[PDB]
Ligand binder design. Structure first.
Ligand SMILES: [Cl-]
Ligand SMILES: [Cl-]
Ligand SMILES: [Cl-]
Ligand SMILES: [Cl-]
Ligand SMILES: [N]
Ligand SMILES: [N]
Ligand SMILES: [N]
Ligand code: NA
Ligand SMILES: [Pt+2]
Ligand SMILES: [Pt+2]
Length: 129
């Protein structure tokens, strides 16, 4: 599914991401914009053979199992395919684990390079929340 901006903000809010670990909702929407263009089915393969999955482009080396990333850990205990669902629950639950992990949202390269230090509130401007 390809989410609308405000549609995704509402979904993320419902699943508890607003101000999770101190990161306002705009941050999460901005990260999803630039990671996947709000498309839950997005996948991207990395040089190291790992693959990134879903709206938040969660990586198979650490977080999910895709059966083709040797000696990977599956810290969210899910198949990577679960992250491609129109229901973003699995992605949100895994992202909460990631951002608690000590590096915060810097774990998302697009967030660090395109969202961090910008006016991220603009991403939820105009939405009914
Ligand atoms: Cl929308
Ligand atoms: Cl949802
Ligand atoms: Cl959730
Ligand atoms: Cl942090
Ligand atoms: N939720
Ligand atoms: N949740
Ligand atoms: N949802
Ligand atoms: Na893995
Ligand atoms: Pt939902
Ligand atoms: Pt939830």
């Amino acid at each position: 599914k390809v989410f609308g901006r405000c549609e995704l903000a509402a979904a993320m809010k419902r699943h508890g991401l607003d101000n999770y670990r101190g990161y306002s909702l705009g941050n999460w929407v901005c990260a999803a914009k630039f990671e996947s263009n709000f498309n839950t089915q997005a996948t991207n393969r990395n040089t190291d053979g790992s693959t990134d999955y879903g709206i938040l482009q969660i990586n198979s080396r650490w977080w999910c199992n895709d059966g083709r990333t040797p000696g990977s850990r599956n810290l969210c205990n899910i198949p990577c395919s679960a992250l491609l669902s129109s229901d973003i629950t699995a992605s949100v639950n895994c992202a909460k684990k990631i951002v608690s992990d000590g590096n915060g949202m810097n774990a998302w390269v697009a967030w660090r390079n395109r969202c961090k230090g910008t006016d991220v509130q603009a991403w939820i401007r105009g939405c009914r929340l």
